[PDB]
């Protein structure tokens, strides 16, 4: 199987309607240090519920 005609920029752009992205919208501010992290993730250097993990 192969095509028979050339679709325009209109149909090619129309098919790309739902292929766009989304913002992560899942950020939060740590209650102690004021630095930011995703929900239910530890921060860049290891704070979660104010408790000290390896921090490396």
């Amino acid at each position: 199987a192969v095509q028979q005609n050339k679709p325009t920029r209109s149909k090619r752009g129309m098919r790309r309607s739902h292929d766009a992205l989304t913002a992560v919208t899942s950020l939060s501010v740590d209650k102690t240090s004021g630095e930011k992290h995703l929900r239910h993730h530890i921060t860049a250097d290891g704070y979660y519920r104010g408790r000290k993990v390896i921090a490396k």
Partner: protein, 120 residues
């Protein structure tokens, strides 16, 4: 067709799965903290904890079952001497999981997994 089944497959055959989980369990028991992907750490808990509840009772037969798994001798000696009496007054739940984001080679959701107190 997956109705009320249990156990992940991890895109490997069975012997490879058993060998990897034995190796991981040995490494965690030795080092007390590791950093692995999330679907491995969510399945590791079903394997590591029965060893720890096995270590609470000192019988020679139970020692040789504990050596029958993990095929290691310094690991089983880390059990029954240090990791045994640490959780002797705790009912279940000896490891904990904390998600820690993504990798940079293949974007896999990693997770720290560590014992409860770590004495550290």
């Amino acid at each position: 067709m997956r109705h009320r089944k249990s156990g992940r497959q991890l895109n490997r055959n069975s012997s490879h799965r058993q060998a990897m989980f034995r190796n991981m369990a040995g490494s965690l028991v030795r080092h007390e903290i590791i950093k692995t992907t999330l679907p491995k750490a969510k399945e590791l808990r079903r394997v590591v904890e029965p060893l720890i509840t096995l270590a609470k009772t000192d019988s020679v037969a139970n020692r040789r079952l504990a050596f029958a798994r993990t095929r290691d001798n310094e690991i089983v000696a880390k059990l029954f001497n240090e990791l045994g009496p640490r959780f002797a007054s705790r009912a279940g739940g000896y490891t904990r999981i904390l998600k820690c984001g993504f990798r940079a080679g293949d974007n896999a959701p990693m997770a720290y997994i560590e014992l409860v107190d770590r004495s550290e």
